[PDB]
Structure 1
Amino acid sequence: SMKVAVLPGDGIGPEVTEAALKVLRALDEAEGLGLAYEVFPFGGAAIDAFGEPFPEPTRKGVEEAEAVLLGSVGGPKWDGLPRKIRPETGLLSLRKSQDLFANLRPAKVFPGLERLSPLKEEIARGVDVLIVRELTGGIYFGEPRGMSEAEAWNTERYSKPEVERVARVAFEAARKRRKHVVSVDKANVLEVGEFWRKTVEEVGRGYPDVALEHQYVDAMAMHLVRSPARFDVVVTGNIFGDILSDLASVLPGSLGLLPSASLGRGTPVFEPVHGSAPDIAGKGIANPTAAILSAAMMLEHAFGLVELARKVEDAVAKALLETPPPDLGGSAGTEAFTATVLRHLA
């Protein structure tokens, strides 16, 4: 079996999700995967239908599935909503309800595609970095939090077990990759950074076969641009991971390329890093690469189909070289780009 909860969301979310659905359907037919999917409302669409971005039928659908394929959420239609029901809060609520504390974001420059990077070729070449981002803690969820007319406040905080568990995922991922972890904090300025580093260092003792290095977040942003090829796994807290993963997104040359996996205690979630791009929704141009590669991450991580995930990745890489979408200077529409991916899969 292969039970998938599909949450298309808003803007280009449904378009890119349908592209990823075509890739999955074509694999189901060829490999006999027994895929069964069901579509649920989430985000702006759920707010308009149920009054909340992560409504009951959707929460039930997620908990009962083996994996979630997620689109994108948000748009100006919902600007000004009380924070508790913003599309963005529904997203945090999804991550939190399944306690998906480990967010995996791979930034990779495919061999031959250095041209597309905004960086000079020799710097972009061989880039293959995995950002492990702590997703259900830190300032995103910390209390106290609030605002009055005179001030506003949010609390960046971590407990020992929260740091331990995300650190352990980073070490396990590194062990399967190039056995190198860079942990990122602001320990020269903050107590939380200090605490972060101390705990990651302790977890590191359990993995003496993996090299551990620490970097300050400001210096890390800089390294991700000057020498990204020297990184294997990067582990950091919620907001630092949010920032650095968008920054890494530029290495391949575009934001519509980065897929992601959210793993923890409950139903794993797979979503393209990009937002809902309201400006281009329904215009048949959104690059579906991120969504497709997220479906690839789902195959590997949720279903253990490593070989299949790589076929998709290989097909996408050829499609990018052959007929790139407009965001990479090409003229291939969402539909045509997906068809290209399909031919290579054959």
Structure 2
Amino acid sequence: MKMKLAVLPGDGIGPEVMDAAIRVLKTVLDNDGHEAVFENALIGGAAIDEAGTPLPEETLDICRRSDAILLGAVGGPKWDHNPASLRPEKGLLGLRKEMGLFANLRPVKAYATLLNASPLKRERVENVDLVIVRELTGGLYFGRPSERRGPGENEVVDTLAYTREEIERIIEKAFQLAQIRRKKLASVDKANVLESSRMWREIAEETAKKYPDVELSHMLVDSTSMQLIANPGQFDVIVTENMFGDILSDEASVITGSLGMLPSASLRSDRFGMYEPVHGSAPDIAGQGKANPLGTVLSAALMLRYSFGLEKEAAAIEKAVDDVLQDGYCTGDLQVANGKVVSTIELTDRLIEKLN
């Protein structure tokens, strides 16, 4: 299997962490009979510098011929002022659209040595292993109209907009995800109030028919909001609209005390996707050795799982992450049990070390 990967590390610690992922990937694969070709491309401030554009035309080409995209992060002070038209961030938004990625997977699982750091009591969070799927293309964030309205513009409106295709494909993906996980999907909406939620539930219920083994259930966003605190262990896969996914993923991002090493996947219908850590570029700590490579490494694992169906490998990588953490190593950000602070590379070496 000749895997074609597009490496787009980006700004700040972007390239630092990316290096971990690439090292770990080469290891995991190259030892069985799995080719993997990397091709670097600029994006964000790095591309602004070498091509006056957050998203270089050549980058899209690089990506369009690759089986998946490995991305770090973008943004930096060096560009925090030029026209918002040509800011690092825009190049990323464009890449998402240009690739037609509509789903955002934000898995959240507990790690024994990170429990003390969790804001929740040990008992509440110790078995968390969920994934929140967020719709990216529709919702209030894209809905038009959206403006003030006379007289004197003392009226305002934002529009929650969705198409049957958008809602269908996202849900369809959530079922596929749940199928290969614990066959359990909670569809989250506000169906007793919003017509888009009403339609959403119907489509969820429709799709459930094509996925018999998956245990579908519905839960309102306001309830899911407290369930993620009171009994987050109950979830396997959660799927929801754009703004609900936005708020819920942020809430969930702190329950296991692993915020800072959370992985992220952006998918569409085919097996093509864009993997990246949830954290930003942390420009000011670049080159200092303090960047945490875990998030990005866990991304590469998701990549192997979602884009190539290589669950064996993807799983190996994840155990390594658990084990290194099990020994108590972090780079200063995570508050691990019996913590020993090492550098981004030291931590990577310990990782690849565990991988055999």
Aligned to 1:298: 303
Which of 308, 312, 318 in structure 2 is aligned with 1:313?
318
Q: Distance in 1 between matches of 2:142 and 2:47?
A: 22
1:241 is aligned with what amino acid?
G
| Contact kept in structure 2, 1:187 and 1:197, CA below 8 Å | yes
Aligned to 1:196: 200
Q: 1:335, CA displacement in angstroms?
A: 1.1
Aligned to 2:244: 240
TM-score for the superposition, normalised by structure 2: 0.89
Write 1 or 2 for the structure with the bigger share of helix: 1
- Secondary structure of 1:284's counterpart equals coil
Structure 1 pair 204/333, CA: closer, same or farther in 2 (3 Å)?
A: same
RMSD: 2.4
**Structure 1 unmatched ranges of 5 or more:** none
Deviates more, 1:275-284 or 1:293-302: 275-284
Aligned to 2:164: 160
Q: Distance in 1 between matches of 2:145 and 2:75?
A: 25
The 5 Å alignment of 1:171-250 reads 171-250=175-254
Query: C-alpha offsets along residues 2-52 of structure 1, whole Å, 9 cap, x if unaligned?
Result: 111000111111111111111112234433422211111111222233232
Deviates more, 1:79-88 or 1:227-236: 79-88
Kindly indicate whether residue 334 of structure 2 is the aligned counterpart of residue 328 of structure 1.
yes
Deviates more, 1:221-230 or 1:241-250: 241-250
Q: 1:284, CA displacement in angstroms?
A: 1.0
The 5 Å alignment of 1:31-70 reads 31-70=32-71
Q: Distance in 2 between matches of 1:132 and 1:176?
A: 14
Aligned to 2:273: 268
- Secondary structure of 1:132's counterpart equals strand
Structure 1 pair 192/64, CA: closer, same or farther in 2 (3 Å)?
A: same
Q: Distance in 2 between matches of 1:285 and 1:152?
A: 45
Q: Distance in 1 between matches of 2:347 and 2:240?
A: 34
The higher radius of gyration belongs to 2
2:320 is aligned with what amino acid?
A
Q: Distance in 2 between matches of 1:301 and 1:179?
A: 16
1:15 is aligned with what amino acid?
E
Q: Distance in 2 between matches of 1:78 and 1:154?
A: 30
Q: Distance in 2 between matches of 1:136 and 1:10?
A: 25
1:191 is aligned with what amino acid?
E
Kindly indicate whether residue 3 of structure 2 is the aligned counterpart of residue 2 of structure 1.
yes
Aligned to 1:138: 139
Aligned to 1:16: 17
Query: C-alpha offsets along residues 158-214 of structure 1, whole Å, 9 cap, x if unaligned?
Result: 111111111011112222222221112233443322332232222223334333222
Aligned to 1:110: 111
Q: Distance in 1 between matches of 2:78 and 2:198?
A: 41
Q: Distance in 2 between matches of 1:296 and 1:90?
A: 25
Deviates more, 1:28-37 or 1:121-130: 28-37
Q: 1:98, CA displacement in angstroms?
A: 1.6
| Contact kept in structure 1, 2:114 and 2:257, CA below 8 Å | no
Deviates more, 1:188-197 or 1:158-167: 188-197
Q: Distance in 2 between matches of 1:263 and 1:337?
A: 29
Structure 1 pair 198/312, CA: closer, same or farther in 2 (3 Å)?
A: same
Aligned to 1:339: 349
| Contact kept in structure 2, 1:103 and 1:261, CA below 8 Å | yes
Q: Distance in 2 between matches of 1:111 and 1:94?
A: 36
2:352 is aligned with what amino acid?
L
| Contact kept in structure 2, 1:106 and 1:128, CA below 8 Å | yes
Q: 1:146, CA displacement in angstroms?
A: 6.5
- Secondary structure of 2:202's counterpart equals helix
Q: Distance in 1 between matches of 2:354 and 2:36?
A: 21
Q: Distance in 1 between matches of 2:92 and 2:134?
A: 15
- Sequence identity, in percent? 51
Deviates more, 1:202-211 or 1:304-313: 202-211
Structure 1 pair 265/60, CA: closer, same or farther in 2 (3 Å)?
A: farther
Deviates more, 1:304-313 or 1:275-284: 275-284
Aligned to 1:287: 292
